[PDB]
Amino acid sequence: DPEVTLLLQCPGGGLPQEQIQAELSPAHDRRPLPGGDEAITAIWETRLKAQPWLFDAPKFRLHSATLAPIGSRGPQLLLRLGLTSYRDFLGTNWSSSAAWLRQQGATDWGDTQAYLADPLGVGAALATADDFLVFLRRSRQVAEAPGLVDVPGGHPEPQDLAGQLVVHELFSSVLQEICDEVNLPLLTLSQPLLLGIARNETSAGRASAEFYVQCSLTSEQVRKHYLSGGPEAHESTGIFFVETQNVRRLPETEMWAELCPSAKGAIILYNRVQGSPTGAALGSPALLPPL
Numbered sequence: 001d002p003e004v005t006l007l008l009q010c011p012g013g014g015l016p017q018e019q020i021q022a023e024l025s026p027a028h029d030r031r032p033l034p035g036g037d038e039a040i041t042a043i044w045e046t047r048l049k050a051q052p053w054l055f056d057a058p059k060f061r062l063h064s065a066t067l068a069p070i071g072s073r074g075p076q077l078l079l080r081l082g083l084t085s086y087r088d089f090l091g092t093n094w095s096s097s098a099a100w101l102r103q104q105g106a107t108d109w110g111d112t113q114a115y116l117a118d119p120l121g122v123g124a125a126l127a128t129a130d131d132f133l134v135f136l137r138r139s140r141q142v143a144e145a146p147g148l149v150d151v152p153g154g155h156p157e158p159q160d161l162a163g164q165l166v167v168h169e170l171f172s173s174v175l176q177e178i179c180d181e182v183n184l185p186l187l188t189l190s191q192p193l194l195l196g197i198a199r200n201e202t203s204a205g206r207a208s209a210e211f212y213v214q215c216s217l218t219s220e221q222v223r224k225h226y227l228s229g230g231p232e233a234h235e236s237t238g239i240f241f242v243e244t245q246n247v248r249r250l251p252e253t254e255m256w257a258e259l260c261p262s263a264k265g266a267i268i269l270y271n272r273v274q275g276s277p278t279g280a281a282l283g284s285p286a287l288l289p290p291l
């Protein structure tokens with residue numbers, strides 16, 4: 001799977017909000033482009049003159065994520081974050097010259113990402129009460145990954161002492177994206193656990209935080225809620241469910257070639273962090289069949 005790389009695998013089956021610190025600093029921002037940020041302004045002007053209803057929005061930038069020594073007390077993860085925008089993304093990661101910017105960043109800064117917007121995404125492995133994961137079909141008319149399978153998620157917009165409010169907005173945003181797109185009541189959802197961070201090598205290395213969320217509704221009840229919104233209540237064109245039993249071998253199925261990179265990252269992290277048992281009971285051959 002060359003189109004996805006794991007930047008972080010969380011310990012303990014995944015980290016709760018109270019175990020994560022953020023450092024939000026202009027030191028974590030994108031570097032100005034070698035020939036100046038005028039190249040970004042030119043791309044944006046061209047795009048607005050074709051689609052004048054488009055609007056910019058601020059985004060969090062991922063710089064890096066450092067895990068504490070395993071089994072330690074105190075905070076277990078430090079997220080180093082900067083600020084970026086939808087405009088900066090379109091002028092860098094989604095530029096035809098994104099690979100040239102990666103080579104230039106390695107040369108100038110020893111950092112393939114130094115000249116890239118790298119907005120932070122969020123995604124969920126969302127499990128039902130009857131042990132299925134939730135999948136969504138992307139419209140064939142959108143610019144990114146048209147017609148591919150996705151999981152719930154989005155790119156959160158900004159509004160340890162500004163730190164804790166930023167971690168709160170990251171965890172909040174994955175629940176809000178489930179309520180907005182799947183049409184589920186907030187009180188049916190567990191507090192999220194962070195599973196890890198995956199990079200999309202087809203989008204010049206932009207990263208998504210991948211979370212596990214449990215719903216108290218069955219697959220049948222989730223479907224009813226999604227469909228009862230009607231076609232204008234969701235960006236996706238359909239919903240479907242795979243038993244958690246069968247998610248274990250999803251990379252060996254024909255579904256795998258239809259999954260967008262960030263959904264592949266969610267499923268790899270679910271399998272490594274929530275699946276893959278370590279104890280004698282769940283690891284016994286009848287409960288963990290070989291092959």
Ligand SMILES: Cc1sc2ncnc(N(C)C)c2c1C
Pocket residue numbers: 057059086089119143144155
């Ligand atoms: C990585 C991001 S941030 C962002 N903000 C607003 N719209 C977007 N779309 C739908 C193109 C994006 C994408 C793909």
